[PDB]
Nucleic acid binder design. Structure first.
Ligand SMILES: [Cl-]
Ligand SMILES: [Cl-]
Ligand SMILES: [Cl-]
Ligand SMILES: [Cl-]
Ligand SMILES: [Cl-]
Ligand SMILES: [Cl-]
Ligand SMILES: [Cl-]
Ligand SMILES: [Cl-]
Ligand SMILES: [Cl-]
Ligand SMILES: [Cl-]
Ligand SMILES: [Mg+2]
Ligand SMILES: [Mg+2]
Ligand SMILES: [Mg+2]
Ligand SMILES: [Mg+2]
Ligand SMILES: [Mg+2]
Ligand SMILES: [Mg+2]
Ligand SMILES: [Mg+2]
Ligand SMILES: [Mg+2]
Ligand SMILES: [Mg+2]
Lengths: 123, 123, 123, 123
RNA sequence: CGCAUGCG
RNA sequence: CGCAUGCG
């Protein structure tokens, strides 16, 4: 009904700036939504939040807390060659990964280096 | 089960400085938590946020964002005689109140003078 | 072609938050535009900036610098009964009025008290 | 007419601290001003902004926003051997560069390592 | 308290 | 450097 690329681009078009943690969260939300076939509920929920006057950022946090697939979900791993591969406005939002990070607690993704070292992206 | 005073003391124990906007947030949190019997789940949430690398200040903010009693809650009105009754480190964080302030958006409390004039505390 | 009220409301609908210095600047821009019959050039210039991807705030500053009526213009006086009459997100942007304040240098308006004391709103 | 070195010294004389992002901005300003013969109008704009109550830091920002040579100007690339060659008080203000940085948007300079890796300075 | 964006 | 908004 909507593709993960169309949704991503729709959400990107509502976000201030570029390569922010919320941008990374768009990618995470759309990849988990595609793999669990929930892109349409994510889409509808997004556009309802906007219609009620929430910020797109609020709308994305609301998604992580309301849509079943993100509830209790662990952040997905993203492979990187170096910290230079991390989006350009996330660098100050990185921390060691805790034992049980959750998307509904602001853990967007786990960046993983070639040596297996990990960095948690945190909202 | 922890009492309101014990939770306040643990939280004050983690905070930097004296009479800050976050010391004021501790009192608001402990009072609402006591009235909804949420003191324990607030304590669990404080210590869970610290464990994943939140500052104490941020961890108090996480309480307002995740503990159900703080969802959409209006800040308490605190009656004062003069501006000097507000802790000095809170002064920089005062501003006129919005139409419908909410604790989970940063509005800690509303100071109110005898002639009904107000000063909002916003982190 | 467009009324000062319709334009104001259009510009207000693009501005983040409420009662900010840029909100006051909308009122100033639309009152000087009405009195000099330049509301339509102000309107067209505003919507061209947005179409090119400028922020509404950028668009308003661009207006003060490009539209003849604001060039070398002094801030208009606004009468107030007290500092409480100043929009609720301008309080930290007030200063003594200089001898020659200009709109194209970020002097939005001059607030004047009943005793004749003045406060400059500065961007 | 003031020389580049004299203008730098006047500006350093107004600034707090040592090796800050604003000391770096002074050097960029003085170098571009010297190359476009804008040193005098930069000096006039610095002293005009101070006179109307701008901090020295803000007054340097006003130069980039009002003096024509800084309009849409790209930050200079400064070649370095290591990160330690960047003044220590500038480190907090480093970030990855955007596609098309502009001085009048806050991009003071771009530090460049021997292998071509970059660090932007953003106030 | 901090990050992001916008603006000076 | 600061203000504004958003978010934690
Ligand atoms: Cl980009
Ligand atoms: Cl990957
Ligand atoms: Cl880090
Ligand atoms: Cl403080
Ligand atoms: Cl106190
Ligand atoms: Cl309002
Ligand atoms: Cl009036
Ligand atoms: Cl003041
Ligand atoms: Cl500094
Ligand atoms: Cl240095
Ligand atoms: Mg964007
Ligand atoms: Mg202490
Ligand atoms: Mg507000
Ligand atoms: Mg109200
Ligand atoms: Mg608004
Ligand atoms: Mg100094
Ligand atoms: Mg940028
Ligand atoms: Mg580039
Ligand atoms: Mg913003």
């Amino acid at each position: 009904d909507i593709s993960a690329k169309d949704l991503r681009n729709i959400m990107y078009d509502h976000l201030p700036g570029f390569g922010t943690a919320f941008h990374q969260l768009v990618q995470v939300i759309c990849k988990l939504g595609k793999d669990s076939n929930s892109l349409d509920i994510i889409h509808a929920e997004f556009q309802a939040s906007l219609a009620e006057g929430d910020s797109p950022q609020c709308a994305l946090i609301q998604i992580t807390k309301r849509v079943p697939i993100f509830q209790d979900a662990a952040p997905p791993v993203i492979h990187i060659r170096s910290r230079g591969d991390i989006p350009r406005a996330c660098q100050k939002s990185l921390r060691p990964v805790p034992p049980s990070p959750k998307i509904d607690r602001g853990w967007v993704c786990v960046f993983q280096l070639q040596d297996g070292k990990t960095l948690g992206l945190k909202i």
